[PDB]
Amino acid sequence: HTVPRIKAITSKMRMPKSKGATVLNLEHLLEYAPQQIDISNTRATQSQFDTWYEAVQLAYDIGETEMPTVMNGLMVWCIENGTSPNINGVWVMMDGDEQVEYPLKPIVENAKPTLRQIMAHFSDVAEAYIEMRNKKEPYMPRYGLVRNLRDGSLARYAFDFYEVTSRTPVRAREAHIQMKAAALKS
Amino acid sequence: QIDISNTRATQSQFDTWYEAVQLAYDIGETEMPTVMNGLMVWCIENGTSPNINGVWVMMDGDEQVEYPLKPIVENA
Amino acid sequence: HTVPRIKAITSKMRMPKSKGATVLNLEHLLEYAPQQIDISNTRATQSQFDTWYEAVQLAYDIGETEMPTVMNGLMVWCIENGTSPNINGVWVMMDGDEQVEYPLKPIVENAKPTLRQIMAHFSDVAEAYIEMRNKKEPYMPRYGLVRNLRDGSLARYAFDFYEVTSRTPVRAREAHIQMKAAALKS
Amino acid sequence: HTVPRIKAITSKMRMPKSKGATVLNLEHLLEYAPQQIDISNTRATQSQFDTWYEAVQLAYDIGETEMPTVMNGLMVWCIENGTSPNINGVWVMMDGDEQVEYPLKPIVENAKPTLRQIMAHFSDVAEAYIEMRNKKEPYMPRYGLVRNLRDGSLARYAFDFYEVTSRTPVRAREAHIQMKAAALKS
RNA sequence: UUUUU
RNA sequence: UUUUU
RNA sequence: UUUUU
RNA sequence: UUUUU
RNA sequence: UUUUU
């Protein structure tokens, strides 16, 4: 009489078995819903990110409360300039009309496995920041200018450490693939 | 078709790998299937090349737990 | 009833967190609006520029009031001739119909990290100066002639130390990319 | 139900055993976290450093309070000039515009196993000092000039007694390897 | 910049 | 990033 | 995976 | 078959 | 390890 429903994982499906015992736990698998970025190797683990954050905070001898401002400045600077392992010298923050420099050693030396993977944690906020800045003036990150990005509307994706995810425009995905290929090309 | 395909590890090889990875983690019979769920999802996201090294990640809710990748690749 | 607005940075966005504490300061990030050229590594820092300016002023034994004229002349000379680290000898100013030479050592030796990055601070004024000079006669900087720039309308961008920014024509950006590639090519 | 964690040192690992008894103490090994430079033979032991410091202080008949200034001067002088066992004569400090010389015998004779290994204790402070000096003028240590170091940004690593550690740039590591090979080459 | 006989 | 004289 | 300054 | 991180 | 003045 009633219309019969179907289970997400069908009852009769070939399953990995060891010693004639199912190797997976379906009860947990159905409820296991980890975000794509939390189980990606292209992004530094939470432990690695915490280690790097603590190391950089200790290197600058900066307190807990002041560190987030430094992190805002570092994210913006990385948005402008690449996050390669080779960057050296000092990165710059603007305290209004005054320029303050911080050493880049602590950031690159403690960033494991890479500074790009560490900054991947800031990818969404970098997107939002570029969106905000573009709402008030033409703000193409310098990485996009180096790559000769002509779209202009792709500025929000045109930084070195952008983490490509499932919920990104296909246009943005293709643009970033092309940009990475061009940058890696000698 | 999949039980007589060389593109798929034999049942004996799969059992050997499963036992080796279970022994490497010092994990019991009951807890291993959860680790296998996490490993399958991680492999779904990231490739299954012989070169993958470091740690693969499971999510115990909002907490990230890492397991060494050596036992998985060396015994496979 | 009323149409509901949306925040620039959405409330529910993945954020970098260390020890279950947000790593960024949104209050400051929203108000953090640093110019693109003030946080660019392709441009010498303000401290480095001040150090170079002071060093060059002291080398010439020139006063505070007379230095800006020397800087005008140096900017024009760099517009004509490249800003490579190799330039040696004397650069030239015109005191009317009289030619006065200044040693190039102090300019190149004190210019850190590079003379190009130091002259990047003069990029906008160089643009304006080339515009002005072109309004009265054909004035293509010698760097554009060496690069065989045929457009003519791109003269305003055809100098060695032009700082490419977000608000530059796409035509100018492509032209300068091609010119830099040609110059670096052996 | 819960996701099972793993121990840093797995329970079932082959261990060195003598007479069927584990030779290592895991409890202490897990907590044993000695800095890399504190267990390196390329650096004089703390006892050797104390012996050398006491010997040099006694040779100069200088008090406890005045010795650190002499040590600052000696570190800077060693930064400029090499720390070979052959250096003889007097090393120089600047008391403003006045030059004061100290005999080099006490420093080299009491420095065991080598003066380079003794000065390795000053490596980090030498790095910082070169960084500071470079922030105000081009300051390449004379050892870098003798080695013909062209990078300029590597000045902070371009002294004889630099102690290569895990947290040093790969660029700096390669540069110092090349510099040491060139210096040792006849 | 030099290197155009 | 540098390498455009 | 890394390699995008 | 392997080689897809 | 030493050998870098």
DSSP per position, chain A:
-PPPP--SS-SS----BSSSSB-S-HHHHHH----GGGG-TTS--HHHHHHHHHHHHHHHT--TTTHHHHHHHHHHHHHHS---TT--SEEEEESSS-EEEEESHHHHHH-SS-HHHHHGGGHHHHHHHHHHHHTTS----HHHHHTT---STTGGG-STT----TTS-HHHHHHHHHHHHHHH--
- C-alpha–C-alpha distance, residues C45 and C120, integer Å: 10
Q: Which of A71, A117, A119, A166 to probe by mutation at the C interface, max C CB count within 10 Å?
A: A71
Nucleotide nearest to A41 (CA to C1'): G1
Q: Which nucleotide is nearest to D161 (CA to C1')?
A: I4
Can you tell me which residue has its alpha carbon closest to the C1' of nucleotide G3?
A: A184
Q: Are strands D90-94 and B64-68 parallel, antiparallel or unpaired?
A: unpaired
Distance from CA of C123 to the nearest CA of D (A): 24
Is C165 (CB) below 7 Å from strand F?
A: no
> What are C101's strand-pairing partners?
C92
Backbone φ and ψ for D84, nearest 5 degrees, come out as: -65, 160
Residue nearest E1, CA–C1′ metric: C87
Which residues 6+ apart lie within 8 Å of B36 measured at CB?
A: A16, A23, A24, A25, B18
D chain contacts of residue A88, beta-carbon cutoff 8 Å: 153, 169, 171
Residues of chain A contacting D, Cβ within 8 Å: 28, 85-86, 88-89, 103, 105, 108-110
Mutate to test the interface with C, among D134, D135, D136, D137 (most CBs of C within 10 A): D137
Which pair of structure tokens corresponds to residue C149?
Answer: 């720039």
Contact D137 C51 (CB under 8 A): yes
ω before C169 within 30° of 0 (cis)? no
| Residue D17 DSSP class | B
- CA B41 to C1' H1, in angstroms, rounded, equals 26
Experiment type:
cryo-EM
Say yes or no: Cβ of D24 under 7 A from any atom of strand I: no
Shortest Cα–Cα distance, D14 to chain B (Å): 12
**Amino acid at position C8, single letter:** A
Per CB-CB distance under 8 Å, the chain A contacts of D168 are 109
CA distances from D131 to C46, C93, D176 (A): 17, 36, 17
The resolution of the experimental structure, rounded to one decimal in Å, is: 3.1
Q: Which of A160, B62, A177 is nearest to A168 (CA)?
A: A177
Separation of D184 CA and H5 C1' (Å): 42
Residue of B54, B64, B66, B68 whose CA lies nearest to B23: B68
Spell out the residues 6+ positions from residue C120 whose beta carbon is closer than 8 angstroms to its own.
C37, C42, C43, C44, C161, C163
The Cα B18–Cα B9 span in angstroms is 12
Burial A41-69 (b: 16+ CB within 10 A, else e): bebbbbebbbbbbebbbebeeeeeeebbb
The answer to whether the peptide bond before residue C113 is cis (omega within 30 degrees of 0) is yes
Q: How far is CA C22 from CA B15, B57, C13, C44, C73, in A?
A: 44, 21, 11, 32, 51
Query: Which H helix or E strand runs over A103?
Result: strand A99-103
Task: Judge whether D130 and D140 are in contact, CB under 8 Å.
Answer: no
Residue with tokens 């005999």: D103
Q: Which residue has the tokens 């204790």?
A: D121
Element (H, E) at B68: strand B64-68
| CA gap A2, A181 in Å, rounded | 55
CB of D37 lies under 7 Å from some atom of strand I: no
Residue D179, token pair as written in the block: 């510099």
The answer to whether the beta carbons of residues D9 and D28 sit under 8 Å apart is no
Q: If you compute the radius of gyration of chain C from its CA atoms, what whole number of angstroms results?
A: 22
Q: Do B34 and A22 touch (CB under 8 A)?
A: no
Does A25 sit within 8 Å of B36, measured CB to CB? Answer: yes
The answer to whether the Cβ–Cβ distance between B34 and A28 falls below 8 Å is: yes
DSSP B64: E
Calculated CA dihedral for residues A93, A99, A103, A107, nearest 10 degrees? 10
- Residue C25 makes CB contacts below 8 A (sequence gap 6+) with A68, A69, A71, A72
Interface test with A, best of B17, B21, B45 (most A CBs within 10 A): B45
Chains touching C (3+ CB pairs < 8 Å): A, D
* Minimal Cβ distance to D3: which of B24, B26, B34: B34
Nearest to A91 by CA among A62, C62, A12, A79: A79
Question: D138 to chain C: nearest residue by CA?
Answer: C110
Contact D6 B67 (CB under 8 A): yes
Nucleotide nearest B54, CA–C1', reads G1
| Residue (of C131, C116, C129) closest to C162 by Cα position | C116
Q: Which residues pair with B55 in a beta bridge?
A: B68
Judge: B14–A18 Cβ closer than 8 Å, yes or no: yes
- Reported as half-sphere exposure (CB side, CA atoms, 13 A), residue B57 has a value of 22
Q: Cβ–Cβ contacts within 10 Å for residue C112, how many?
A: 23
CB contact under 8 A, A39 and B58: yes
